[PDB]
Amino acid sequence: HKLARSLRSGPSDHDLKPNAATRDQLNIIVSYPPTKQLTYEEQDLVWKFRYYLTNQEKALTKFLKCVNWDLPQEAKQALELLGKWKPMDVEDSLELLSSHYTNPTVRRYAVARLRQADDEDLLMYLLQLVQALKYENFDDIKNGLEIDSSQIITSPLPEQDLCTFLISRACKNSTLANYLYWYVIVECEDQDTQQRDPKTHEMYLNVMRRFSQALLKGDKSVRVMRSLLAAQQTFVDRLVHLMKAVQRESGNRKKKNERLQALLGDNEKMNLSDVELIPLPLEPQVKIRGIIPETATLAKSANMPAQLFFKTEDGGKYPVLFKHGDDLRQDQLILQIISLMDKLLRKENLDLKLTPYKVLATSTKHGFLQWIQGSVPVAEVLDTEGSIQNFFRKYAPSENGPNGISAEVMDTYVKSCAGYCVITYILGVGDRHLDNLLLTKTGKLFHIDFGYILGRDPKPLPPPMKLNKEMVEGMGGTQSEQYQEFRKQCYTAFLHLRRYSNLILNLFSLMVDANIPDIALEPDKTVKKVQDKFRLDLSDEEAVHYMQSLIDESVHALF
Numbered sequence: 030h031k032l033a034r035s036l037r038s039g040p041s042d043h044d045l046k047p048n049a050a051t052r053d054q055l056n057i058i059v060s061y062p063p064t065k066q067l068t069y070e071e072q073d074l075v076w077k078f079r080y081y082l083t084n085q086e087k088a089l090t091k092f093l094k095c096v097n098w099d100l101p102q103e104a105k106q107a108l109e110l111l112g113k114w115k116p117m118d119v120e121d122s123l124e125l126l127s128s129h130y131t132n133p134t135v136r137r138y139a140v141a142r143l144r145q146a147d148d149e150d151l152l153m154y155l156l157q158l159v160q161a162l163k164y165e166n167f168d169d170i171k172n173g174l175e176i177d178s179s180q181i182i183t184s185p186l187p188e189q190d191l192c193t194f195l196i197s198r199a200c201k202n203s204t205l206a207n208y209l210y211w212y213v214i215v216e217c218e219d220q221d222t223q224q225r226d227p228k229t230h231e232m233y234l235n236v237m238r239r240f241s242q243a244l245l246k247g248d249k250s251v252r253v254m255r256s257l258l259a260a261q262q263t264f265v266d267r268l269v270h271l272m273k274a275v276q277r278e279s280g281n282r283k284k285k286n287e288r289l290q291a292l293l294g295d296n297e298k299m300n301l302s303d304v305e306l307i308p309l310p311l312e313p314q315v316k317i318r319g320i321i322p323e324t325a326t327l328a329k330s331a332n333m334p335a336q337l338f339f340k341t342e343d344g345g346k347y348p349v350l351f352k353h354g355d356d357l358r359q360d361q362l363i364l365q366i367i368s369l370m371d372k373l374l375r376k377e378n379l380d381l382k383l384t385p386y387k388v389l390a391t392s393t394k395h396g397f398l399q400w401i402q403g404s405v406p407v408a409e410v411l412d413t414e415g416s417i418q419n420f421f422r423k424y425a426p427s428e429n430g431p432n433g434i435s436a437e438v439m440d441t442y443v444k445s446c447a448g449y450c451v452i453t454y455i456l457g458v459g460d461r462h463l464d465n466l467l468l469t470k471t472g473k474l475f476h477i478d479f480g481y482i483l484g485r486d487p488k489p490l491p492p493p494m495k496l497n498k499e500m501v502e503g504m505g506g507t508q509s510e511q512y513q514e515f516r517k518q519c520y521t522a523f524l525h526l527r528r529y530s531n532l533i534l535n536l537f538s539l540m541v542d543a544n545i546p547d548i549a550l551e552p553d554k555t556v557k558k559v560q561d562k563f564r565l566d567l568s569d570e571e572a573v574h575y576m577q578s579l580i581d582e583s584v585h586a587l588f
C-alpha cells in the first residue's frame with residue numbers, strides 16, 4: 030500500500046484500455062453516490078484506469094480523492110489529468126466545493142464550472158454554496174479588502190475563488206443579492222460558529238464586508254441595490270424589536286394582540302405600517318407598502334409566531350408567519366429542497382401541484398414563512414366537514430366529476446398526495462399528524478413544520494411511507510380509478526427523483542457543517558439516510574415494484 034499510486038503506474042500505461050469485465054467494475058464505482066467511501070482497492074483501480082476515465086465526466090470527482098496531494102509527483106500528474114479530463118456538469122461540481130477537497134486548483138476549477146450555470150439554477154444551490162465558504166481559503170477572503178453584522182450594509186464609508194464569484198454574480202443579479210445577503214447574515218448571527226469556530230465567524234463578516242464594498246464600488250444601479258438591502262435590514266430590525274416589545278409585555282394573548290396592533294398602527298415611532306415600497310426579503314418580487322395593523326394576530330403556540338399581512342405594490346395582501354424565538358433553518362433547508370424537487374419533476378414535465386412555500390431566516394433566532402392563503406389543517410377539515418371528500422364537495426362540486434367533486438380538484442389532490450408521499454419518504458420527514466398536513470380548496474395537499482427530518486421521529490419505528498387512512502378515502506378508496514392514478518404518480522416521481530440523486534446528495538453533503546439540529550446529531554451518517562431511500566441498489570423496473578409494495582403494505586395495514 031505505502032508505495033505511492035504514481036510510484037505504481039505512470040505515464041508508461043497512458044496507453045491502457047480496460048477489458049469488458051473491468052469496465053463494469055469501474056462504472057459501478059464511478060456512479061456511486063458522492064459520500065460513499067471508496068476502498069483502497071477501488072481507489073487503486075480508479076488510478077490505474079485514470080487515462081480511460083478522462084472520457085466519463087461523472088468519474089472526475091472520484092479520481093481526485095485517490096490523489097495524494099502531499100506527494101508532488103502525484104499532485105502534478107493529477108492536475109495535468111484535470112485539464113485533459115472531460116469537463117463535468119454543474120450538477121456535479123457542487124461535490125468538489127464540499128469539505129472533502131482542499132486543493133486550491135480543484136476548488137477554483139469547481140467555481141469555473143459553476144460560472145457556466147445561469148442564475149436560476151445557481152439560486153437553487155445558493156444556500157449550500159454559502160456553507161461551502163467554510164471550506165475556502167480564509168486568508169484570501171480577508172485579503173480582498175480595500176462589528177455587528179446587521180450594521181455593515183447600513184454603515185457606508187465617506188480564476189475566481191468562491192467568495193469572489195458569488196459577490197460578482199450578486200452585483201449583476203438582484204435576486205441573488207437578496208438571498209446572498211440574508212444567508213450570509215445568518216452565518217454571521219450563528220452563535221455556535223462564534224463559540225467553536227471564531228475564525229469562521231470572522232470569514233463571514235469579511236464576506237459581508239467584501240459584498241458591501243463591491244456594492245458601493247459598483248455602478249449606479251448596483252449602488253441602489255445596497256440601499257434596498259439596508260432598507261430591508263432596518264425593517265427587519267424594527268420588526269424584531271416590535272416582537273420583543275410584545276413577547277415581553279406581560280398579560281394574556283388577547284392583551285398582547287391589542288398591543289401588537291398598537292405598535293404597528295403607530296408609524297412615527299415603530300415605522301412599519303407605511304414602509305417606502307421596499308422589497309420583501311422572503312420574495313423580493315413582492316415590494317411591500319407596509320404591514321396591515323388591524324389584521325395582525327399572534328398564534329396560540331409555543332414561540333408565539335405573528336401572522337402578519339403585508340399590503341403590496343399591486344394592492345394585494347401577502348400574508349406571512351414571522352417567528353421570533355425559533356430556529357427556522359431546518360425548515361429553510363427542507364422547503365428549499367422541496368422547491369428543487371418540484372422544479373426537477375417539472376423539468377421532466379411532471380407537475381404534482383406541490384406547495385414549496387417560501388422560507389427565509391433573517392437570523393438564527395427568527396425569520397419569515399410564506400402563509401398559503403386558503404390552507405386548512407386536515408384535522409380542522411375532518412373536524413368541521415367530516416371527511417376530505419365532504420370538504421371538496423362543499424367547496425368544489427361537479428355533476429360529472431368523481432364522487433360529485435370537480436375532476437380538476439380531485440386530480441390536484443391525487444397528484445399532490447403522490448408527490449408529498451414520495452418526497453416525505455425520501456427526506457425522512459417524521460412527526461406527521463393531521464395538524465401539520467394542510468389542505469386547500471384548490472385540491473392541494475401539502476406538509477408543514479419539519480421539526481423531525483432524516484429518519485428522526487418521536488416514535489422509534491415510524492412507518493416509512495407517511496400515508497394515513499383519511500388521505501386514501503379522499504381519493505375514493507383503494508378500488509377507485511383515482512388510487513390507480515395515485516400509485517402511478519408515486520412510482521414515476523420516485524423514478525424521476527432517483528435520476529437526480531447525485532444532485533440532491535451533493536447538496537446535503539454541503540449542509541453537514543450547517544448547525545441544523547437533525548443533521549448535527551449524526552453529520553457523517555446524515556447523507557446515507559437519504560441516499561438509502563433512493564434504493565440505488567435496485568434497477569428502475571425493480572424500484573417501481575418496490576415503491577408499489579411500499580404503498581400497498583402501508584395501505585393494507587390501515588385496514
Ligand SMILES: O=c1cc(N2CCOCC2)cc(N2CCC[C@@H]2Cc2ccccc2)[nH]1
Pocket residue numbers: 328330334350386398399400401402404405406467477478479
Ligand atoms: O411552519 C408553519 C407553517 C405554516 N404555514 C406556512 C404555509 O402556509 C400555511 C401556514 C403555519 C404554521 N403554524 C404554526 C402556528 C399555527 C400555524 C399552523 C396553521 C396552519 C393553517 C391554519 C392554521 C394554523 N407553521
